[model samples]
Target: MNTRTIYLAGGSFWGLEAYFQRIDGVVDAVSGYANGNTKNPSYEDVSYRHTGHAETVKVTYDADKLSLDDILQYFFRVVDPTSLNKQGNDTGTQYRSGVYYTDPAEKAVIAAALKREQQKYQLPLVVENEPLKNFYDAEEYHQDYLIKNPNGYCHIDIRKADEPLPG
Candidate 1:
């Protein structure tokens, strides 16, 4: 299978996962904690125990259908790349922006993407471009959370993909 996985932390995983799941090439989107300090950290651990993990979404996409750049472009659209440690109402290190990759080659791709995205903003983009240190799958209750709880709090506009981009 010609697939690639990237871990992205932009605000909350509920919205990020839901957003990626709606994309054309995404095969799966799982909520989790990424690049954290501890192993097998629970949602409570990340939130309360200072685990230093960002709420991340692991997105698996078919490379034949969508390039890594394409997925990153979508990510930039929904996230405020210049904002530090905050997205919407969420404010903390766990909500920090990051692009964690298991493959070292992808670091260059992510760096290029961030550089391109930087041109559009006055402030430097704070999104992390680093190797994935660790990722722990969130509890089942956190998976597909927005789908299960339609009324859940989500920072992203999940339907933006359906709309035509503005010129």
Candidate 2:
């Protein structure tokens, strides 16, 4: 089976990772940082607003089971695409919404997805769509944090189950 990789940034990696991991086609969701200037940014460095990194999730998924467009659709529902520096209670550059594409093809896919989303809302999409730069994996403890602590804090609320894929 073929698979595709995508890196997306939402509010908290913990919540974002948990949410994406639960998706059907998603094979893995790992916490990380991306779209930043820092070479190897720490959580503290990103949180402190020095690294310009956003808390992100690296997702590996089966392309046949779920297309990139399908994944992007679900992602937009959980995240506030209109918000610039935050999602829910989380606030900072690190908590910003962004799609970090690894290559030009991925970048084009993201751009098309963003355009479709914008048309639906009739509003400008605020989520940053850019080429993937430096991606630094987060601390090991942060991986699958929600699974480890089911009662943990999370701003995301699964409003729509299996968000309809764009036609």
Candidate 3:
């Protein structure tokens, strides 16, 4: 089916997930935690335990419909690539922005896009780029939070009154 996946951590998945869900080729946008030292962490463990997990989104997409380069570029647009461990009002290491990939081939795509995106800012970007290490699904309530709780606080921008995460 020419499907592919990428994991991204960008300050509170609620808004990130909400935004990517609408992109043309995205098959699924899941709320999760990744690149962390812990395994199968709960949402509370991540938010307060210093488990080193950054709230991340697992985005599966149709490769034929969207290139990874294009996908990441769009991600950069919605996040402040230069901000470290913060977005909107959320703050802490868990709120950091990152791009973690599985395929070795994806590294080049990530690197190229990272460099291109960095040009827009004077400060070195804080967005992390690395190989995917670990992932764990958050509680069901965290999934599609913007969809489930429209009034929930979201770190991702409200593209619409209705939209937000890889909030």
**Worst-scoring 10-residue span by lDDT in model 3:** 158-167
TM-scores of all models?
A: 0.96, 0.92, 0.91
Predicted model with the maximum lDDT = 1
Give one digit per residue, the lDDT tens place, for model 3 in 51-146.
Answer: 999899999999998788867867887888988898888899998999999998888888888898788889998788899999899899889988
Model 2: lDDT equals 0.85
The better-scoring model by TM-score among 1 and 3 is 1
Off by over 4 Å in 2: 159-167
Q: Judged by TM-score, which candidate is best? A: 1
> Which regions of candidate 1 are displaced past 4 Å?
163-167
Candidate 1 per-residue lDDT over residues 1-167, each given as its tens digit: 69999999999899999999888788999999999889999989999899999999999999998889988988988999999999999999999999999999999999999999999899989999999999999999999998899999887898876654333
Ranking by TM-score: 1, 2, 3
Better of 2 and 3 by TM-score: 2
Summarize candidate 2's per-residue lDDT along 5-66 as a digit string, tens digits. 88899899888888888788999998998888887878888888478888899989998999
Mind sharing the TM-score for model 1? 0.96
- CA RMSD, predictions in order: 1.7, 1.7, 4.0
